[PDB]
Design a protein around this ligand. Structure first.
Ligand SMILES: Cc1nnc2n1-c1sccc1C(c1ccccc1)=NC2
Length: 127
């Protein structure tokens, strides 16, 4: 079995910013989800080999996880908040696409997504 390369977290060619919205996404959004009891499956890329999910990367073509998002935020990979918000939404969507309704992992994603939505609702205006 084989995992794909992880998503990109470093690209010197890509223009970068450190904006107050992106700071909020790290300090509030990421940190809130990261510390949650259901965070652990989402803290690194899905290891399809160890988890014995040989069809995972057949179905999921835009993988994303909070480990990757954490690296992107801490290493200032983004230009804007929308990019990062999209990464979170990709992460949740992948979970719902791959798994069955009511599965434990789906319930975990739903709990994290509820908090995500609560925090993004108060994304500060640009300074
Ligand atoms: C993320 C993600 N998206 N789909 C899956 N996962 C992961 S990544 C580590 C375990 C799981 C699990 C899982 C299953 C039951 C309880 C906790 C995690 N299911 C497969």
């Amino acid at each position: 079995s084989m995992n794909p390369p992880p998503p990109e977290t470093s690209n010197p060619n890509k223009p970068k910013r450190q904006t107050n919205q992106l700071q909020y996404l790290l300090r509030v959004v990421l940190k809130t989800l990261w510390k949650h009891q259901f965070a652990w499956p989402f803290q690194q890329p899905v290891d399809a080999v160890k988890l014995n999910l040989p069809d995972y990367y057949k179905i999921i073509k835009t993988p994303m996880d909070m480990g990757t998002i954490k690296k992107r935020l801490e290493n200032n990979y983004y230009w804007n908040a929308q990019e990062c918000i999209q990464d979170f939404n990709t992460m949740f969507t992948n979970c719902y696409i791959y798994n069955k309704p009511g599965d434990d992992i789906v319930l975990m994603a739903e709990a994290l997504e509820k908090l995500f939505l609560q925090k993004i609702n108060e994304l500060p205006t640009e300074e």
